[PDB]
Amino acid sequence: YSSFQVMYTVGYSLSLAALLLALAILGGLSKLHCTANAIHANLFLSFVLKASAVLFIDGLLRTVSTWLSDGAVAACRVAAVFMQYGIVANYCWLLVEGLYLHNLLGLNIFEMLRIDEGLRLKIYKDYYTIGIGHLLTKSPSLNAAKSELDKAIGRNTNGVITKDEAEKLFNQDVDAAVRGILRNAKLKPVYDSLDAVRRAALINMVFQMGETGVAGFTNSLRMLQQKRWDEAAVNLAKSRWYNQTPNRAKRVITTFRTGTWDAYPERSFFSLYLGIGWGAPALFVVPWAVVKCLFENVQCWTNMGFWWILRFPVFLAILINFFIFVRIVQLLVAKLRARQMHHTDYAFRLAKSTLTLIPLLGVHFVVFAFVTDEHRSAKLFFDLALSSFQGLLVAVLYCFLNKEVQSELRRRWHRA
Numbered sequence: 537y538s539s540f541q542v543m544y545t546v547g548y549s550l551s552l553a554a555l556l557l558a559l560a561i562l563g564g565l566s567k568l569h570c571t572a573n574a575i576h577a578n579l580f581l582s583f584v585l586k587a588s589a590v591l592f593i594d595g596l597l598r599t600v601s602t603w604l605s606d607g608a609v610a611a612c613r614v615a616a617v618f619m620q621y622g623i624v625a626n627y628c629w630l631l632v633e634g635l636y637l638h639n640l641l642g643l644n645i646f647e648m649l650r651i652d653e654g655l656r657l658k659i660y661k662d663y664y665t666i667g668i669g670h671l672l673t674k675s676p677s678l679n680a681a682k683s684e685l686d687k688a689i690g691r692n693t694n695g696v697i698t699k700d701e702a703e704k705l706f707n708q709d710v711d712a713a714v715r716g717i718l719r720n721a722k723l724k725p726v727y728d729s730l731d732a733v734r735r736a737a738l739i740n741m742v743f744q745m746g747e748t749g750v751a752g753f754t755n756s757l758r759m760l761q762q763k764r765w766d767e768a769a770v771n772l773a774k775s776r777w778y779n780q781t782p783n784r785a786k787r788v789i790t791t792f793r794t795g796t797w798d799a800y801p802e803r804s805f806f807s808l809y810l811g812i813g814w815g816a817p818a819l820f821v822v823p824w825a826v827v828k829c830l831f832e833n834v835q836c837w838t839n840m841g842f843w844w845i846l847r848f849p850v851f852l853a854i855l856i857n858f859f860i861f862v863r864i865v866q867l868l869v870a871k872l873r874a875r876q877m878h879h880t881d882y883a884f885r886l887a888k889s890t891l892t893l894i895p896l897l898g899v900h901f902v903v904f905a906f907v908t909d910e911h912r913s914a915k916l917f918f919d920l921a922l923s924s925f926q927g928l929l930v931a932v933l934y935c936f937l938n939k940e941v942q943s944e945l946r947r948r949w950h951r952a
């Protein structure tokens with residue numbers, strides 16, 4: 537146990553140093569402020585909580601529990617709760633990581649317009665409109681709109697259509713928008729000198745206000761053509777288009793400003809991530825801390841530390857992760873086959889870390905769960921020794937090896 541104690545001490549302390557360093561890096565570099573890095577930071581924090589609790593409990597008990605004093609039992613129990621909380625939070629944030637990557641892979645111009653326009657199988661005022669944001673006519677007459685709809689679909693729809701017909705209209709409208717940009721003299725050079733995400737951001741506006749409607753922001757076009765994203769964002773915020781549809785304009789403007797899909801899907805969607813990563817563990821850990829304090833309030837509530845009963849929420853988090861994992865793979869090979877992306881892409885590089893971490897941590901937890909119930913000490917010491925380094929592994933995979941992080945570090949180094 538002496539060697540085992542030394543090994544997990546080195547593992548958790550090294551993990552803690554690396555995690556605090558990674559947190560200082562993500563927090564201190566403003567250009568790295570994306571949703572993915574906020575998720576990584578919260579994951580880092582959960583491991584920081586775990587490692588801090590482990591090192592503290594270890595200092596209090598192994599540097600016994602039958603005769604602990606009033607302050608000792610208190611600090612020890614608080615540390616035990618924080619340890620359990622950190623352990624469940626690890627897997628819940630790995631789950632959030634899988635969710636974010638999965639949603640990121642599904643994002644494109646199609647999904648973006650699909651979020652900003654929705655899908656209405658019946659005609660509605662936006663001007664009469666149906667399907668996914670498809671204009672019918674600006675004429676007040678309802679029959680005049682229904683006529684254009686029935687003519688466009690080639691049948692008596694009576695103002696009601698199917699989803700297949702709607703998306704069929706959708707693909708055409710996207711094609712027409714892109715051709716409208718390419719034919720335009722004042723829009724094409726701007727579109728050519730743009731990354732795929734911002735190109736989609738321009739196509740959004742063309743899909744909403746037509747070709748000439750976006751052509752009318754030439755003073756705002758030259759700015760993003762000059763890569764002055766900030767002032768372009770401000771001037772776009774000043775525009776009448778912002779006053780008419782602020783909620784959509786914010787997402788598009790931030791898509792121009794950040795060059796990321798972070799605006800999508802929706803604002804405060806991150807609160808769900810917070811609820812899963814921090815709240816969900818609280819839902820299971822708090823009541824069981826209550827049961828511990830009420831009925832098993834002995835020693836330090838000290839399975840090698842982790843509470844037995846808490847397996848199952850983690851199991852749940854792992855189970856869901858499995859289905860996410862599979863889906864992600866299916867998207868990846870799809871995007872690679874269609875050449876919609878390649879290995880230098882951010883989604884792929886994120887997948888390199890997340891798709892290793894999910895099976896690694898999941899299989900490790902399942903193995904731990906089976907071994908702890910065998911009533912085996914060798915397998916426990918080995919797996920826990922290696923598991924102590926997991927915070928270091930996460931910090932390395934999500935931060936230190938990250939291309940944007942290293943690029944920013946090289947840039948700040950080169951500026952000097």
Ligand SMILES: COc1ccc2cc(-c3cc(-c4cc(Cl)cc(Cl)c4)nn3[C@@H](C)c3ccc(C(=O)NCCC(=O)O)cc3)ccc2c1
Nearest residue numbers: 868884885886887888889890891892933934937938939940
């Ligand atoms: C697309 O699907 C997937 C899924 C899993 C994948 C897993 C690996 C892989 C190969 C190896 C390995 C290990 C040894 Cl000892 C020797 C040799 Cl020769 C190779 N490690 N790993 C993992 C451990 C890994 C390595 C780097 C990064 C990274 O660089 N992240 C940061 C990227 C960034 O942000 O720029 C993240 C994981 C590679 C592609 C993958 C692709």
Ligand SMILES: CCCCCCCC/C=C\CCCCCCCC(=O)O
Nearest residue numbers: 569570571572574578581798806814
């Ligand atoms: C018990 C301690 C652990 C619980 C602490 C939880 C408190 C919230 C912590 C971090 C909040 C992170 C919010 C960051 C928003 C960034 C959004 C973005 O960049 O897209």
Ligand SMILES: CCCCCCCC/C=C\CCCCCCCC(=O)O
Nearest residue numbers: 556557559560584588589591592595
């Ligand atoms: C300081 C870097 C910036 C990031 C801030 C993250 C918030 C820090 C949260 C907890 C810090 C505790 C780490 C030290 C624990 C030591 C445990 C021990 O000495 O036994």
Ligand SMILES: CCCCCCCC/C=C\CCCCCCCC(=O)O
Nearest residue numbers: 638642852855856857859860863867
């Ligand atoms: C007792 C509760 C058990 C819960 C089990 C959960 C099983 C399903 C969990 C996650 C499923 C997510 C699959 C994502 C498919 C998205 C489709 C797409 O990518 O377009």
